[model samples]
Target: NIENLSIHQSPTEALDSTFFHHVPLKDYGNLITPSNNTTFTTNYEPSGSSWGEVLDEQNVYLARLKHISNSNNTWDLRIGKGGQIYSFIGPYGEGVPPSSKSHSQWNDEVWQPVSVSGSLNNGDQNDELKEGATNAGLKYFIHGAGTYLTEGLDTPFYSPLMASYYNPTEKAYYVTNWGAQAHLPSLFKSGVLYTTKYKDIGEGILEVTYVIENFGTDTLDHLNIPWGGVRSSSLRGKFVSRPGGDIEIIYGQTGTDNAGDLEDIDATGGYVIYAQDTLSASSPALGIVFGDKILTEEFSDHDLTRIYYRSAQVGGDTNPRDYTLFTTIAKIDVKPKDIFYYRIYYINGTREEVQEKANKIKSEVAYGFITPTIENTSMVTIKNEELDDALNQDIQLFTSPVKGMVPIFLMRNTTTGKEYISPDLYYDIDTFPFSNPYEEDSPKYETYQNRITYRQYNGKIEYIRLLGYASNEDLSNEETQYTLLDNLIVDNTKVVLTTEYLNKLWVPLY
Candidate 1:
């Protein structure tokens, strides 16, 4: 083994990254930029009291995100992991204080599944559900059948996948996770892979692609994703369905909710900014958003229905009914191994920037997926070492993690006027000699030889794509194009490592 090939975190945590440490998005804040944007000072070193703490001056910079699962089995996007559907069977509202800093404690952070209705300015109107709450935003359910047939869908089911990735060269990041549930008899399986990407093409826009697939042999008749959400912010949000059948939303004016509550715009209805800095004391204020229909609706091959927030057909939430945004896919006829693709863009930024990204996403929504790539990749190994073994600022290259692969490391050096090639030994993803991306193998068997092939962006480098060999075809997406590594431009590298791979010029190749 050239290096240890094991990841010691939970499957869901792969999507987690310290928002303060890694500049997954372009951050040009007045105080921390350039250094905070390019270096991992906080990530490698002990920089703060809590991993979730925002940096001292973290403001207007990009932010971090958490992977929330579908605890309520509401047929929305979230993987069902912790806790029974509800805790303590409350007749009123209750909350679980987040236990510890780790993910296991994420559930305790509190999430009430009861649906209530109110303007973004008005709160969920009513919180106490047992005595009976009304207007549930998007909470509804099934009549009798626990397992579904090939013709329709259900609420949240079993088996879900969630993971996040970042591109140093392309200065981009995304959370491309999967959610699936199945039932026996006529045989059925429902899956949705929410591939959400953040790239410069859209500046701060999030491209959410729902890859609804059928993993089982039965035919999945249809699938519906209710994009409805409720916010806990001080701004009232307005929702409108387009004539062509998409959705548009805008948070208008500073508002109040329930007099007793001040919200933070909480919901999956659209992209939202969170309160508090992830690591530093920064606040991201770019709230600009734009889109043509904001989303192009589709169901099977026809236009997807623009579903309004509605109470369940038979039963609903509590007192008031929660406003729901219904977007869906119908008559999918999803057989084994078949996938249905649905996409939408979540843009955010200054008014100018938001419109620009909105226009960009609207123009390219049909483009499928776009990732950064490099040509003629390089492999730099540690060479001509001195006794001390402390290579401070020699350009280093690290591999980003993909779904079913192990990690790989590469490094570079540019002594005072002591370098040759202009490329700086580019070592990254896409096609390497041993790229292995089989969907069937356990991640434990993944090796560096089989690097998963995908693309990304970092604001710094002048990166591009390259054509090369893939270690494993099944593991790699043959139909998709682009090689992984691009020009990872960095003047002084501060590599984060504690391994034997440090001594060896481990780039396997010269």
Candidate 2:
């Protein structure tokens, strides 16, 4: 319904001071791809711009949901929507911190003014981030206890990758693509695929899903991912915490702190990130639970509070609550390309409603048979939407700059005992026939016209599937799911050189 997409007119309604920079002027990540994996590249620019500035009013909530570049075919038009926030009212001021700032008095460079306690402190607030917002994401930490992921000093925050769309036929039923996309060698890399997706799960619930994968050459070990954001008894009013008490509550599932009231959460209490996979992934996506629990069984140099915060550094009720406020999952090991899926089934309403959805997403994963997932994503179109001049074929299915996390399942219980075979495949699918490697090792020339084709290696696989290109599996029994297969499984599963859709990497049979 939005016909006017003038850059001048659009952000004008929203706050420009809080607007974002799309050029990727950050020090090193200019080679961005369509499938950049909800992986964020840190802001090497030194400016805390994308950190976040509050809007100060519910009326302008729609303001920050501004659009700049469109992700679809209609590049010039406004086909996407989203923005980011890393802080709302500074980490301390009333904001301040660290080997950091002193909290003696309010720092205007960090605090945003509001009607808290007395009148507004017009003179207070970070001059740059007074009211901006950055994408939401988890801070990564690794090694020792002082620094989370970088030079033993904690890496900078890389806001989430975001996009919004409006289409009834689209796979998702929401308006925002607000999520994170960060990568490797730092706190986390293309060696990894971390995606944070946002969509409405109905009944006032927002469905937030994150798919993390290690697509690197070596395994990622001793990594830690910590949680951030407003965490308190009063936090029940935030997204996912609908207050009425269902799955997650201030104290317990059936939070009775308020008794009869919905918003009566104990404002004094705060939330913390504890150990175990259930703490983050819950029981829902068992097979897809997030990375190895906050700590691993390896026990080598394993310990808690490694970069982000050490328990001892954070004094109880005395020191700045930053340490106590944030929690980390210490244990982790990601073999090249292993994907971990996690989700939060929070409500858009009462607590009971929240619990209802908590189990809902789990059911969707297990009994519902939810395997591969692609959040509100689009398929990579063929070469500039042009036909391949060489073979008169559409290049859309031929090349992919990024690989999908899962494979398409094409096996049927009905075909259990039956032997199935495929027609000849050739690198020549794109052009002239490729030569035999044995013009190097020719096979034994024997029976005439009885040539055996296909490798004995292809038989151990459970399915006969083409790479999946769709994924709406849970919408209904009628809806289908599509996912990429290459680089999906096995230790060396990779995209076949000339063609795509070889979704899995199977182990060689003896």
Candidate 3:
């Protein structure tokens, strides 16, 4: 047997660069273009207190890892043995406290089951249910149901250290996990290999190429990988980009709730951004860019809904609820002896500069979700003679000139005389006097308004079919064409109302 294959260290006194070769993504993964102006140095010299204290105590093994940093200290990434980034400091700018200057959020720093385990605290029975890692990282497991070898989706709390090294010639860090080091060894029995390579591609962007190889004999099915999360708390972290828009974390938002709330956003763009403040020309910003070409080509068939945010607090911590954890769930099936990989860029810069950097690799820099807006009102209904007349007629659309009263599409069955209303649609009632949306008297107003506005701005409304609307126009008289309402665009349009209430549907011209 060749003993060098099992050797974890490089040959002593090796001076030749030929000993190492660059691993191209397309060889076994996806392709990406990195920046051209930055060069990251592999930092092996101990930083002592300059790196601050480790945030994750559970992963004690992380205390001894090395780091990579740019010349200007724009970024300092401490990577653990299992390839987890224990701490990160980027674009070191305003509002960033000099004391313990790590921006990553930490909670026990280990992967747990997808869903909450029965018990809490340090462990859920035999499992470690505590939060894992800091902000940016990845974890793999089987999602739904249970396999004969593993229970539920729980894989290993901590991955076994395979090999971690910093190549001086390559100016990169390679961390690999063979799935052989943790308590749960079944995940690796099939010969699954997880490896990450971190290299600075310039422009202050660090490109992380994540690869998973199936060296097992059988197909590894039901595979789900939770990847790409950058935690931002209200204290140090201010704004985070979602799929369709941006969400600002509100302080005391949870109001002392131990179990923080969360929201799921579809990461169609496969990218997200976290900024200390509104991205300005000088303010620091970090972009989590999943290669646009990679996602469109490699992950088009997979699920992107897994990308989400745990909005509120998870435990009894002061600023826990004020944190937003940006997470992405990538799903793929790896054939035996085959490989799959995803390329992501963790770049830091000013707001505009970060956007420029992100757009250089991604199709566009966009928000992952939109913020909800609500007006204070006791009643959502308005008394309008014109609206009452339109509601009495056949299927018709109407737009009001008065402020707060937006567009409304009402469908009425001429024969049955029954009217249908889209509840999820946004409507403003001018008659109801405005009140504070957060006022105690209008407590439900904020919740109701937020839900309504979220759907409206997100360009989706459910319950259409249940409301007697059909996508097919050939349906019976009882059904109304859902497209007429669903396809309604908010652009300027004129609706012709007939005095006679006949079975008619008016679609406005764009």
Candidate 4:
């Protein structure tokens, strides 16, 4: 805060009684006084002094009184807390210009010795001087005794000064409170002026009324903000990393040092590209090609169809025909306004081959498979009776057995119709016993013969036999026994019986 001390004129009368009266002005003349001085002494060599002499005399009195006041005054009020002093004149020093010295220098060299009680308030005369000691530049200084009289200016709160006065001739506020306004033409002058009526008259006096409409909104609803309008929003989809899409190359040596035997190289891998179809149709077809060669046979016609095919050749053949590959069938559901991304992997001998295959597939699908004809065509036809008989046969075979463990029965050339033993009849047979001659010997035992007989009525006869076997061992032994009876003649003709055995197990050939 700026404290205004009492303002007073130089007391020349009071100085005559002070101790400074003993120092004669003539002794310090020419050494410290100004060279130019005009003294008016009409009768006795001009009794009054010049400006230089008066200034010199004032300095002498001010210096002597400052010493006296400094000793007498115990508390220096001018050095109070938050106190600061500034002068309109320069600092008190020999040969100093009043305008060149700052207020802080004046207080340090002059006022501290004079024991001034309060801050000297310098009026806001010049712009630079006004921003000196007070809060003019948004900052004030704190005064301390025995310290330098300089005060720091706070920079944070300072605002920029106006460049020039606002010009009223243009009917515009040239300088806004914050800064200069833009120099473009006003909205009213751009042929978009809001007016009450439109008129066209030739240089004649006419009565016109100006009307203004006030819309409640702060800004015009239609008018956009500077550099602001509808901006495009980027549509981003998730990135799917397919580790299975990588292609690896493997080599094998066949000859002594991998010399001969048709150094075969296999290029077989499957890739899939998933994309959302925005069409509103059923069974939309997607096409893919490899190396510009269309691969329509790789995919199945429907989702339920599973196509499993060999991808690489196991043998040593480098020719392309040695390898068989197929793409798995997949069904992707698409909806309108939804986002989708595709992950396509290439599997081949090298990265170049994979990339080439991927590019070819993409191009083929885009240009050929997704055409209008393909998208709208019917791809699948469901037949009502095609699977009816097969399904019924499967149900019957699974539910019933022909004879015991045998699931199938066949009759050889026979006069009578083929006869097959029922499963219930075969299951009722028990062990057949035979008495031995010696009581100590093991009892001779024979298993029940579970069979189906085909009787012969003519000379040319065929015999058919059905047997129940629990295992492959039983079946093999029964067939071996029937082989011994192959040439047995019945009624002057050779009899041939076809041996049939069935079991419910799958055995792989080594």
The residue-by-residue lDDT of candidate 4 on 39-126, one tens digit each, is: 1111111112122211222221111101111111111111111111111110111111121122222222211111111122212223
Q: Number of clashes in every candidate structure?
A: 56, 58, 16, 4
Per-prediction CA RMSD (Å)? 19.1, 22.1, 25.0, 58.3
Worst 10-residue lDDT window for candidate 2 reads: 112-121
Which candidate number has the best lDDT? 3
| Candidate 3 lDDT | 0.35
Best by TM-score: 3
Total backbone clashes of candidate 2, pairs 3 or more residues apart or in separate chains: 58
TM-score of 3: 0.45
Ranking by TM-score: 3, 1, 2, 4
Query: Candidate 1: where are CA atoms >4 Å away?
Result: 1-164, 172-202, 224-226, 230-235, 239-331, 349-360, 367-510
As a whole number from 0 to 100, the lDDT of residue 126 in candidate 1 is 38
TM-score of each: 0.33, 0.32, 0.45, 0.13
> lDDT by residue for model 3 over 180-233, one digit each (tens)?
212121111224445556765555666666555444444443322323233334
Report how far residue 498 has shifted in candidate 3, in Å.
83
Model 4, residue 57: distance off in Å is: 99
Worst ten-residue run, lDDT, model 4? 224-233
Q: Tally clashing residue pairs in candidate 3.
A: 16
Writing each residue's lDDT as its tens digit, candidate 1 over 322-404 gives 21112222222434444444444443333333333343344333312122122222212222132122332222222222121
